[PDB]
Amino acid sequence: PQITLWKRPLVTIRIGGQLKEALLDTGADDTVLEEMNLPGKWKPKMIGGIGGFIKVRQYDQIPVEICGHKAIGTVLVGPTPVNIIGRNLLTQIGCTLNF
Amino acid sequence: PQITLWKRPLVTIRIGGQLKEALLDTGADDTVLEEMNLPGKWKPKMIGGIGGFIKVRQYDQIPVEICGHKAIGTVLVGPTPVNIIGRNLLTQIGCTLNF
Ligand SMILES: Cc1ccccc1CNC(=O)[C@H]1N(C(=O)[C@@H](O)[C@H](Cc2ccccc2)NC(=O)c2cccc(O)c2C)CSC1(C)C
Ligand SMILES: [Cl-]
Ligand SMILES: [Cl-]
Ligand SMILES: [Cl-]
Ligand SMILES: [Cl-]
Ligand SMILES: [Cl-]
């Protein structure tokens, strides 16, 4: 797809058995999902941006489908206000910024 | 250009006559720069990101050259972690996401 930026670039993703809406975010190094009771082993992490840092749970080798395109990698879970797909998974689906 | 995402998508901008490095950020509604001087009128504003809300100064109708392409729009100044080019100016230069 080609996605314009008039509005927030929200797409459907599949992760952990759930369909969700998530933000395609070239500013994010990694992927962070709204709080959910995902199974598996995890390790604690802090991530930071506008407003400071939040504590999240880091899960590894998690399958994610983004708009029909498959990926697998690290997913963070915690008190983000929006589900965010970052560069770690955007590169796996071939996404580029074009102008 | 077609910018892939293995590294942060940083580019050179010119604003107020000065050259700076900035991040092309599709997850940001607004353009937010580190502390600097800009000419003309401003008013206080609040924005929220991954960690919560911050106070910024809002400058309207500011020319910005981004990787060679002209934009003129709103620039926020305040305690951002990095210089951020958000959707308000990415749309002006014709940026889309592609995969
Ligand atoms: C988000 C994430 C995921 C994994 C690991 C670290 C991080 C933290 N990174 C970051 O926060 C990076 N940024 C990003 O990733 C931004 O795209 C951020 C994403 C977001 C969207 C809605 C709610 C909350 C956050 N958006 C904003 O901060 C944002 C949101 C709305 C208006 C506004 O003026 C701004 C600047 C902006 S600052 C940053 C370049 C460091
Ligand atoms: Cl849940
Ligand atoms: Cl297939
Ligand atoms: Cl990963
Ligand atoms: Cl700089
Ligand atoms: Cl604007």
Which residue in the set A49, A91, A96 is minimally distant from B50, CB to CB?
A49
What residue has token string 């927030």?
A8
CB–CB of A52 and B51 under 8 A?
Answer: yes
Technique used: X-ray
Q: Specify the 3-state DSSP secondary structure of A87.
A: helix
Which ligand lies nearest to the CA atom of residue A61 in the structure? 4
Q: Does the beta carbon of B50 lie inside 6 Å of ligand 1?
A: yes
Resolution (A): 1.1
The residue count for chain B: 99
Q: Which chain A residues touch B87 with a CB distance below 8 Å?
A: 5-6, 8
Q: Choose one of B32, B50, B83 to mutate for the ligand 1 pocket test, by most ligand atoms within 8 angstroms of C-beta.
A: B50
Q: What share of chain B is helix, strand, coil (3-state, %, to 5)?
A: 5, 55, 40
The CATH number linked to B78 is: 2.40.70.10
- Say if residues B65 and B92 touch (Cβ distance below 8 Å): no
Q: In what order do the strands lie in the sheet with A96-98?
A: A2-3, B96-98, A96-98, B2-3
Is A76 within 8 Å of chain B by CB?
A: no
State how many domains chain A has: 1
Looking at the DSSP bridge assignments, the partners of residue A40 are none
Which domain range does residue B54 map to? 1-99
B29 flagged as catalytic = no
Per-position DSSP letters for B21-59, written without gaps between them: EEEE-TT-SS-EE-S----S--EEEEEEETTEEEEEEEE
